[PDB]
Amino acid sequence: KFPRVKNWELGSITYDTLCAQSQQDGPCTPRRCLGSLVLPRKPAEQLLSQARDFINQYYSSIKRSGSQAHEERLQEVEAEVASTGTYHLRESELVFGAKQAWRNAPRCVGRIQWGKLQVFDARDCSSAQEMFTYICNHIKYATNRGNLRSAITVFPQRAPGRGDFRIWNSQLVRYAGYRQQDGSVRGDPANVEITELCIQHGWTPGNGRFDVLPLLLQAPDEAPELFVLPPELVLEVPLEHPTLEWFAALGLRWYALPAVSNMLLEIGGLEFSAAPFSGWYMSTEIGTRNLCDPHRYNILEDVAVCMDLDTRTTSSLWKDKAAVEINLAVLHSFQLAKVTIVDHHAATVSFMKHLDNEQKARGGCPADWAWIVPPISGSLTPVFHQEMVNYILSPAFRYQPDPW
Amino acid sequence: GPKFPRVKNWELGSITYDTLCAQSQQDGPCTPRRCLGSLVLPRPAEQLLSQARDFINQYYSSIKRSGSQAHEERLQEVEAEVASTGTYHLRESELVFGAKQAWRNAPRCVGRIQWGKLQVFDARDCSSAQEMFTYICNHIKYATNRGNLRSAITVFPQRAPGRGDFRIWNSQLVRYAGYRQQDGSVRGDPANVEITELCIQHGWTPGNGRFDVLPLLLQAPDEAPELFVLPPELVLEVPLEHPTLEWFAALGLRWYALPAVSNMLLEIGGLEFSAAPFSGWYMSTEIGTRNLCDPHRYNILEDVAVCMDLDTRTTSSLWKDKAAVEINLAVLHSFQLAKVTIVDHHAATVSFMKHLDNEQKARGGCPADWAWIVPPISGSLTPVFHQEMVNYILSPAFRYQPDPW
Ligand code: HEM
Ligand code: HEM
Ligand SMILES: CNCCN(C)c1cncc(CCc2cc(C)cc(N)n2)c1
Ligand SMILES: CNCCN(C)c1cncc(CCc2cc(C)cc(N)n2)c1
Ligand SMILES: C[C@H](O)[C@H](O)[C@H]1CNc2nc(N)[nH]c(=O)c2N1
Ligand SMILES: C[C@H](O)[C@H](O)[C@H]1CNc2nc(N)[nH]c(=O)c2N1
Numbered sequence: 052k053f054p055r056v057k058n059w060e061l062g063s064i065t066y067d068t069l070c071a072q073s074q075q076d077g078p079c080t081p082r083r084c085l086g087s088l089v090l091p092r093k094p095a096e097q098l099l100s101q102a103r104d105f106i107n108q109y110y111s112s113i114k115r116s117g118s119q120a121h122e123e124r125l126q127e128v129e130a131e132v133a134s135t136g137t138y139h140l141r142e143s144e145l146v147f148g149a150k151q152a153w154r155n156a157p158r159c160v161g162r163i164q165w166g167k168l169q170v171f172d173a174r175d176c177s178s179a180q181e182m183f184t185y186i187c188n189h190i191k192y193a194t195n196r197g198n199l200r201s202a203i204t205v206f207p208q209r210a211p212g213r214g215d216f217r218i219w220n221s222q223l224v225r226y227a228g229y230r231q232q233d234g235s236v237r238g239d240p241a242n243v244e245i246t247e248l249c250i251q252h253g254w255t256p257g258n259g260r261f262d263v264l265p266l267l268l269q270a271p272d273e274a275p276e277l278f279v280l281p282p283e284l285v286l287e288v289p290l291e292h293p294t295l296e297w298f299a300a301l302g303l304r305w306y307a308l309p310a311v312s313n314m315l316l317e318i319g320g321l322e323f324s325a326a327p328f329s330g331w332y333m334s335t336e337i338g339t340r341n342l343c344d345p346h347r348y349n350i351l352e353d354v355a356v357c358m359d360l361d362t363r364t365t366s367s368l369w370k371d372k373a374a375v376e377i378n379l380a381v382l383h384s385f386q387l388a389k390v391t392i393v394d395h396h397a398a399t400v401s402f403m404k405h406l407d408n409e410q411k412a413r414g415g416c417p418a419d420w421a422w423i424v425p426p427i428s429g430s431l432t433p434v435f436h437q438e439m440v441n442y443i444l445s446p447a448f449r450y451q452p453d454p455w
Numbered sequence: 456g457p458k459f460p461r462v463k464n465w466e467l468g469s470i471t472y473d474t475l476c477a478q479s480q481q482d483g484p485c486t487p488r489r490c491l492g493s494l495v496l497p498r499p500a501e502q503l504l505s506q507a508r509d510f511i512n513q514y515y516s517s518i519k520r521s522g523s524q525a526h527e528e529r530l531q532e533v534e535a536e537v538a539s540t541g542t543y544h545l546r547e548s549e550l551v552f553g554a555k556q557a558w559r560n561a562p563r564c565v566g567r568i569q570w571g572k573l574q575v576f577d578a579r580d581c582s583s584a585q586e587m588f589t590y591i592c593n594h595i596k597y598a599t600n601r602g603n604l605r606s607a608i609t610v611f612p613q614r615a616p617g618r619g620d621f622r623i624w625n626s627q628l629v630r631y632a633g634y635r636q637q638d639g640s641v642r643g644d645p646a647n648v649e650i651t652e653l654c655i656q657h658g659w660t661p662g663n664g665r666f667d668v669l670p671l672l673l674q675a676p677d678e679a680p681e682l683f684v685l686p687p688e689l690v691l692e693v694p695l696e697h698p699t700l701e702w703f704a705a706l707g708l709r710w711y712a713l714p715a716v717s718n719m720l721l722e723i724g725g726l727e728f729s730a731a732p733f734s735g736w737y738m739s740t741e742i743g744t745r746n747l748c749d750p751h752r753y754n755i756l757e758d759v760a761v762c763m764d765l766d767t768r769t770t771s772s773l774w775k776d777k778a779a780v781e782i783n784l785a786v787l788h789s790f791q792l793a794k795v796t797i798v799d800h801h802a803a804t805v806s807f808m809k810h811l812d813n814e815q816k817a818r819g820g821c822p823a824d825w826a827w828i829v830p831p832i833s834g835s836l837t838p839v840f841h842q843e844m845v846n847y848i849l850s851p852a853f854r855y856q857p858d859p860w
């Protein structure tokens with residue numbers, strides 16, 4: 052049985068058949084749905100089968116499926132697993148695998164872009180120092196003077212005999228969070244733990260709200276090392292508002308490059324524990340979540356007071372009013388600085404086009420509705436009205452435990 | 456540790472475990488292979504007895520008499536009744552318990568903090584379509600209460616073997632007509648096109664406004680549905696104005712005070728009440744965001760944004776978000792002015808979090824549909840956005856049922 056998927060705005064119905072290609076179970080059972088949970092509660096034969104399936108995927112994608120190059124390649128993989136317990140990917144295969152991982156990421160609204168991804172092979176990396184070099188080039192390439200380009204750098208895969216290559220930071224750019232004795236937090240509350248780990252490993256702390264953290268980089272079975280990014284590498288956008296002169300006074304800012312550095316990339320059963328990837332922001336990530344979440348910078352009441360709003364009652368919708376001006380500020384400021392950004396309406400409309408492309412290409416598209424629908428103005432966007440099917444395809448980005 | 460779903464709040468960092476889901480007997484649409492949680496509508500003899508036995512156990516527990524002699528005698532009384540007739544009857548207070556528990560169990564309802572405060576009108580004696588009309592008018596009168604809205608449900612006779620159903624054809628007691636135009640467009644509410652055409656086929660003389668109140672199509676057992684027009688003074692409405700945008704009132708928008716769902720099935724202990732309309736009060740985003748701004752409903756966003764003189768030629772001006780906010784404010788302001796009960800999406804979600812905490816202590820969980828609980832605007836500004844939820848089906852329940860035609 053294949054899920055029947057309906058759009059409630061248009062009346063149109065599709066059938067997801069791609070989900071039958073899922074080999075990995077999610078958190079739901081027929082007794083109870085667990086789709087709103089953020090994290091999971093969580094053999095040569097099995098590695099070999101994921102390898103076969105992936106190699107078949109690759110040769111099918113270049114329409115050389117069944118051919119001699121294909122046959123001989125499966126033989127290589129099988130021969131290599133049989134005597135070493137593992138294998139290695141060709142650069143071309145890794146490029147394919149990385150693009151598919153993005154394509155398959157059900158929580159990502161930006162997947163219209165999935166075929167345009169620059170892949171840096173960093174598998175010849177043997178130290179934190181080289182990782183840092185690779186990371187710096189990635190940032191320079193990706194940022195491209197505000198003309199953002201999507202990229203991934205892939206460090207050496209996990210191996211049975213040793214500890215992982217890891218980037219301890221959750222993103223390549225993070226603002227420090229400084230825990231106060233008086234309970235509160237200066238800077239980004241989301242980054243208290245990593246800030247403290249940086250200090251413990253000997254970083255000289257700042258005292259600002261927007262102090263860019265150093266990277267903690269780890270080569271196998273070694274203590275992590277500390278590397279400060281050259282400030283000229285981290286593009287930042289001061290936030291002002293198009294018609295509210297006082298907004299700029301607030302001294303708000305955000306960095307240009309969203310670069311996730313703590314997820315695991317799995318391809319054909321191989322696991323890449325350090326494989327930082329980046330694109331460009333959707334404005335609501337900065338304007339709504341990072342700046343307005345109560346457990347983040349939490350600036351809503353501040354902005355509302357400057358707007359002289361009735362802060363004393365919920366029914367004046369001050370929160371809603373302030374959040375809209377904040378999101379507008381982010382868009383205006385990024386556009387003024389010529390740094391790539393996408394608003395949530397433009398993003399969700401392109402995501403609808405992606406669904407349509409994928410329906411035609413693959414018979415469906417794994418999508419996590421709760422993460423696709425923006426944090427403000429949900430039903431004002433087309434994705435709100437679109438039913439979606441969530442499931443796990445490989446290659447995939449996965450979460451993994453923090454390495455401390 | 457515990458072998459039940461771990462549930463996390465990401466704002467507060469706090470953890471619970473849902474043990475109540477263990478009580479679920481009916482399977483939802485998901486499997487380990489794929490999550491179908493965002494689908495609005497996914498695809499008796501011994502059976503009856505087990506559902507019946509379970510409900511009576513629920514009832515006696517609610518009154519703290521499990522295992523008692525009255526408990527076992529009621530169980531005996533029920534199976535005796537099923538053995539000789541195939542069905543059975545609820546005592547009055549069982550029906551009252553069941554109706555409240557059905558609301559309490561409703562995963563898509565954010566208003567469940569009020570669940571214990573429900574007026575239950577017993578209408579299981581009703582025997583004509585004219586009589587259904589009297590019960591409905593009475594319900595509307597009681598529930599509207601001149602703007603001081605009171606939750607209520609009226610329960611009509613249960614499905615009976617052989618005999619036909621009591622059905623209310625309309626999806627709500629109050630519904631604006633949707634008139635399909637020559638040019639293909641719709642005047643009024645596009646959601647109500649079919650029911651409008653059904654009323655007409657059954658002899659209603661149609662109007663031509665954006666806000667014409669539909670007559671009721673009420674159906675008694677094995678009879679064609681009869682048509683009934685509500686006395687306009689029984690249908691309380693609120694004209695919409697804005698607290699500072701003076702032109703907003705000139706738009707001629709309005710909404711009715713009483714949201715009363717009339718097409719759902721109430722199931723208790725295997726017994727099915729095919730007509731059992733229930734009503735509460737509105738959360739403002741239902742009117743202001745969904746009914747007025749959905750592209751496939753009234754679709755007024757562009758009208759308002761033009762009046763607000765916003766740049767509607769580019770998404771990045773956030774004209775849609777700006778207009779939606781003011782439309783929601785107008786709804787809240789106009790209901791407040793008219794002294795008609797309403798709740799904003801902030802107050803409502805805050806009260807739902809309190810409800811989740813009450814239920815965690817009372818029952819060890821609360822079935823909840825995250826996509827439906829989180830409001831259609833300002834999602835992450837409300838605390839439920841940061842709350843993981845477990846969705847599952849408990850009974851008593853309100854269920855969807857096929858349209859009777
Ligand atoms: C090009 C512009 C892109 C945009 C606008 C975009 C947008 C987004 C957004 C809004 C989210 C939700 C994030 C959150 O709320 O925490 C997300 C998640 C995600 N994105 Fe994209 N993305 C882009 C590029 C990429 C690229 C290049 C990759 C990988 C190569 C990627 C992979 C992912 C993954 C794996 C997630 C899920 C993260 C998680 O589960 O925490 N995205 N994206
Ligand atoms: C007292 C104030 C109440 C409020 C603010 C409230 C709020 C809501 C809201 C906002 C929804 C979402 C509906 C949609 O978006 O289509 C909903 C659904 C629902 N409500 Fe409540 N409600 C209230 C009272 C009641 C009562 C008295 C009952 C029954 C006794 C009830 C039962 C339900 C059920 C069964 C649904 C699911 C409807 C569906 O799945 O289509 N509610 N409610
Ligand atoms: C669920 N735990 C981790 C959350 N996480 C990895 C995360 C948190 N906050 C923000 C992001 C940014 C995600 C992202 C990635 C890319 C490539 C582009 C973009 N605009 N956003 C990710
Ligand atoms: C999704 N299928 C059913 C449609 N449906 C029942 C529905 C649609 N649109 C709006 C409502 C209103 C739901 C409701 C019910 C009650 C008692 C109170 C309230 N505030 N809202 C219901
Ligand atoms: C509990 C809930 O699932 C959680 O708050 C989710 C909701 N949807 C989200 N959507 C996005 N894009 N990012 C998020 O962090 C979240 N958080
Ligand atoms: C596809 C999606 O499930 C559908 O549009 C849902 C989303 N959440 C909703 N939430 C509520 N309260 N009411 C709705 O009608 C919907 N529609």
Ligand SMILES: [Zn+2]
Nearest residue numbers: 079084485490
């Ligand atoms: Zn699910």
